[PDB]
Antibody, heavy 214, light 211 residues
Framework: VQLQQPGAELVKPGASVKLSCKAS????????MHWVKQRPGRGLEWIGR????????AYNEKFKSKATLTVDKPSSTAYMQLSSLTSEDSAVYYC?????????????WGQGTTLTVSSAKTTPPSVYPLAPGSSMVTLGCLVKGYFPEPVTVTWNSGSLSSGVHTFPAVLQSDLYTLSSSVTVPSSPWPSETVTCNVAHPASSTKVDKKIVPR | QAVVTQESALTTSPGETVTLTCRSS?????????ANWVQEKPDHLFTGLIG???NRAPGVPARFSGSLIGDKAALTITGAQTEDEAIYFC?????????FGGGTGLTVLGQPKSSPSVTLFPPSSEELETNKATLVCTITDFYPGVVTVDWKVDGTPVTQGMETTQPSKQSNNKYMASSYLTLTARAWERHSSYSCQVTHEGHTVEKSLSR
């Protein structure tokens, strides 16, 4: 019993997609196939559900003409097709099974598919230095506007491996941007030069940036 | 067409007892909305503990237990485990549709509490020549992992062009987050006062840079 569904897809705006969920396990008829959409920062949204046997379906009006639930009996697969995909559709999409009302639950969830509505074409990041304007000291590198994921930011050829934090990227302008801040002690800097190391293999880009005061 | 409410976040200690509510904007929760509590572990893990209000999916540590208190459905983790520090999504049934609440971020302190270290960076000079200014505000070592972020350009609170990652566990088990505020290099020279306000646990910490 494992509800397998592919982990990711890329899709251009205005297009549509069909997310498949092949139910590896004990039954289909005995269970219901619901669909849920998790977007970082706004929990879960029930899209709807479909019955294996008949095909009949009920949805969340908010997706009334966005999703289209179907099911193929010969392959124990459940599909969901979103049409006219827009920037909001970008989300993690799951297919969980329902046990009758009888114990009444969503015992086994599919791992989700990370749909990505984006017109962006491969694009290299732009490294910008983040420096203090005044004991310890926080320096940084802004890795702005890059696609696709994911970027590799390191400090001093690996030498600074602490006082370092590289946060998650944020999506906007259909490009990702993130940052790495490094707390190197107030003595080293400005004294010892501090340099951040960014690489975006998706473009095969590699850049250096020495954090200078200003 | 119905809004199901859940607590923002809850901090319990090990060996303790904690309880999450699940409110209905349509009325008190009935047995007809089989609130089905579902757990969320980081990196998209999802398991349902309680179904049908009362029933516990098979193989759910007996300590998790469903029930109705007052007018709301309720998940009561008895003897909360450190491995319970996770997001809890509740769901309600309404005749033909289902509705998931806001979920609860539950912290199970297994380290003392820590405050956020705030750092608000100015636009790189280089970026400015690109007719762009990105205010970078970093937030590290705060625990529990829940903060609210606010900016204020010229004492005025900003309502757009600002975004913040969701708290991500640090190597230590504490949390970190990064907030951004994007501006046209032109919009930058127009204002003077800038501040990143991070509230963690109800205590605010400001960091500002005058231009």
């Amino acid at each position: 019993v494992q509800l397998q569904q592919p982990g990711a897809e890329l899709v251009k705006p205005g297009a549509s997609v069909k997310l498949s969920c092949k139910a590896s396990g004990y039954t289909f008829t005995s269970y219901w196939m619901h669909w849920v959409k998790q977007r970082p920062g706004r929990g879960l949204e029930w899209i709807g559900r479909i019955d294996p046997n008949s095909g009949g379906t009920a949805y969340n009006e908010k997706f009334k003409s966005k999703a289209t639930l179907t099911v193929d009996k010969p392959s124990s697969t459940a599909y969901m097709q979103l049409s006219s995909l827009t920037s909001e559709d970008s989300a993690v999409y799951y297919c969980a099974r329902y046990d009758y009302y009888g114990g009444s639950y969503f015992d086994y969830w599919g791992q989700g598919t990370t749909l990505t509505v984006s017109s962006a074409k491969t694009t290299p990041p732009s490294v910008y230095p983040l420096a203090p304007g005044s004991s310890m000291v926080t320096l940084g590198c802004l890795v702005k506007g890059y696609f696709p994921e994911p970027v590799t930011v390191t400090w001093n050829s690996g030498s600074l491996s602490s006082g370092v934090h590289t946060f998650p990227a944020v999506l906007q302008s259909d490009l990702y941007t993130l940052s790495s801040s490094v707390t190197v002690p107030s003595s080293p800097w400005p004294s010892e030069t501090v340099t951040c190391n960014v690489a975006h293999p998706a473009s095969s880009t590699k850049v250096d940036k020495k954090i200078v005061p200003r | 067409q119905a809004v199901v409410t859940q607590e923002s976040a809850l901090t319990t200690s090990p060996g303790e007892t904690v309880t999450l509510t699940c409110r209905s904007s349509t009325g008190a929760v009935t047995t007809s909305n089989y609130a089905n509590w579902v757990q969320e572990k980081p990196d998209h893990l999802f398991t349902g503990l309680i179904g049908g209000t009362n029933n516990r999916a098979p193989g759910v540590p007996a300590r998790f237990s469903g029930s109705l208190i007052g007018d709301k459905a309720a998940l009561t983790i008895t003897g909360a485990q450190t491995e319970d520090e996770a997001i809890y999504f509740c769901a309600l049934w309404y005749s033909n549709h289902w509705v998931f609440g806001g979920g609860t971020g539950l912290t199970v302190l297994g380290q003392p509490k820590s405050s956020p270290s705030v750092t608000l960076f100015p636009p790189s000079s280089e970026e400015l020549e690109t007719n762009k200014a990105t205010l970078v505000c970093t937030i590290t070592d705060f625990y529990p992992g829940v903060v609210t972020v606010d900016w204020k350009v010229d004492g005025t609170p900003v309502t757009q062009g600002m975004e913040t990652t969701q708290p991500s566990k640090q190597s230590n088990n504490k949390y970190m987050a990064s907030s951004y505020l994007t501006l046209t290099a032109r919009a930058w020279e127009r204002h003077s006062s800038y501040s990143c306000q991070v509230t963690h646990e109800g205590h605010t910490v400001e960091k500002s840079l005058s231009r």
